[PDB]
């Protein structure tokens, strides 16, 4: 895999070249969302209100990404009903405020559904 490891980098360097050049907002959002540690946990669902797990690593990302019960991601609209914490322990919206930040278990994990 050693020489394979060189042809490996060439293909997926080239891929993110062809992705930066695609210049989609949805692609460029999920790509750069993931660069600061905010990555999907399952495939993005396009279907009507199917399951979407994403990882949020810090409150900064949080108050950058969460509008009440609505979390914007992937140039789409997402509706939540499951936010757990690092110790797989469920949290609540109100509890993720600017006033509770340092006590909580980052990263958090939101579960989401496509919005009508």
């Amino acid at each position: 895999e050693d020489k394979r490891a060189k042809v490996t980098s060439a293909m997926q360097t080239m891929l993110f070249t062809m992705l930066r050049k695609l210049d989609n907002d949805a692609l460029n959002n999920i790509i750069n969302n993931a660069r600061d540690g905010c990555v999907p946990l399952n495939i993005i669902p396009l279907t009507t209100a199917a399951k979407l797990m994403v990882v949020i690593p810090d409150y900064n990302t949080y108050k950058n990404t969460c509008d009440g019960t609505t979390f914007t991601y992937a140039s789409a609209l997402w509706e939540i009903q499951q936010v757990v914490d690092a110790d797989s322990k469920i949290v609540q919206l109100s509890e993720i405020s600017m006033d509770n930040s340092p006590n909580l278990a980052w990263p958090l994990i939101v579960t989401a559904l496509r919005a009508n």
Partner: protein, 75 residues
Amino acid sequence: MSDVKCTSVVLLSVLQQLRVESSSKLWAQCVQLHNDILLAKDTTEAFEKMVSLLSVLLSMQGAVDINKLCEEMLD
């Protein structure tokens, strides 16, 4: 939309060479997501499947470090 077909063909192979042809279900969904993109005749559906396909590569905690790929680009 020449490009979006082509990004798609290469995303699948990046995931293929990451030995997810073993993946059977992960693979199958990508194979038809790649197949549906090829059969697209407009931009949105094509970017809409394209966004899902790439979610897979980003959800693989060690498939590759995007920070170190990104840091490799302009260095």
